[PDB]
From TrEMBL, chains A, B:
Residues of the full protein shown: 616 to 772 of 896
Limits of the Cytidyltransferase-like domain: 6-126
Family, similarity comment: Belongs to the cytidylyltransferase family.
Superkingdom, taxonomy of origin: Eukaryota
Protein name: choline-phosphate cytidylyltransferase
Residues reported to bind CMP: 10-11, 18, 95, 117
Binding site for phosphocholine: 10, 48
Length: 133, 133
């Protein structure tokens, strides 16, 4: 009955959007283990761009989040069939918002969609602070 | 054996410092319920000063934190003996960093000290972003 869910990401400056996404992945089935992968500094810079917090800082914040059961830090940038078998992962939870490399997961019945929440990012709150001066 | 711990605070723009403090309060005894109080917007402004996030925003983030068992939102600004009895609270966890109104708790054996962690605040990270331009 226990289902292993994997979600990966940068988790830079963790905000309520990340946390709601993690909650959604945790709650995809009644009984889950949610494994979170945290991307390396070098690979995040190479493929996505700047990152504000180091791998160690992004990983430490994640350990305080209720929905996170296990952490792979750092995690590989691209998910592979071999990775799923190594960690006995039953489903990969993704927002399907580009960053379709995941078609093979959908084909296999192993893709579970999650959503984002806008207007909650750390960035947006400095904007809220500054719109008082 | 279960001990009810109460920690209150603003919890504005929650960062790793808050989370480590909550972890410390949760882990003060083997078996605890950690109740977190979140201060009202009006009282935080009157007594401490500006607050960036609303009560609802600060409370929602807290529900995602692993160590938080129950939330009183909003909570009273000053802890009273009557409040401890109403909620069956065994100890109040505070950093003892001023903001001694807590002498009566120390007298009663109900004060448990927790510590802060500097350099982790949301504020500090924009400073880290800006020191690249
Ligand atoms: N490692 C995959 C990945 C990378 C960046 N952002 C994501 N959401 C997922
Ligand atoms: N940066 C990833 C992410 C996750 C959830 N919500 C967002 N708005 C963004
Ligand atoms: N409600 C008490 C209080 C108010 C502000 N900051 C704290 N840490 C505690
Ligand atoms: N603002 C309260 C607080 C809690 C923990 N650590 C800090 N540095 C500050």
């Amino acid at each position: 009955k226990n289902v292993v869910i994997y979600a990966d990401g940068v988790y830079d400056m963790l905000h309520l959007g990340h946390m709601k996404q993690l909650e959604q992945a945790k709650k995809l089935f009644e009984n889950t283990t949610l494994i979170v992968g945290v991307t390396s500094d070098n690979e995040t810079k190479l493929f996505k761009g700047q990152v504000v917090q180091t791998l160690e800082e992004r990983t430490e914040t994640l350990k305080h989040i209720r929905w996170v059961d296990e952490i792979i830090s750092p995690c590989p940038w691209v998910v592979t069939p071999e990775f799923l078998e190594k960690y006995k992962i039953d489903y990969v939870a993704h927002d399907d918002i580009p960053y379709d490399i995941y078609a093979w997961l959908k084909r296999a019945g192993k893709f579970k969609a999650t959503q984002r929440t806008e207007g909650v990012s750390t960035t947006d709150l400095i904007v809220r602070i500054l719109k008082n001066y």
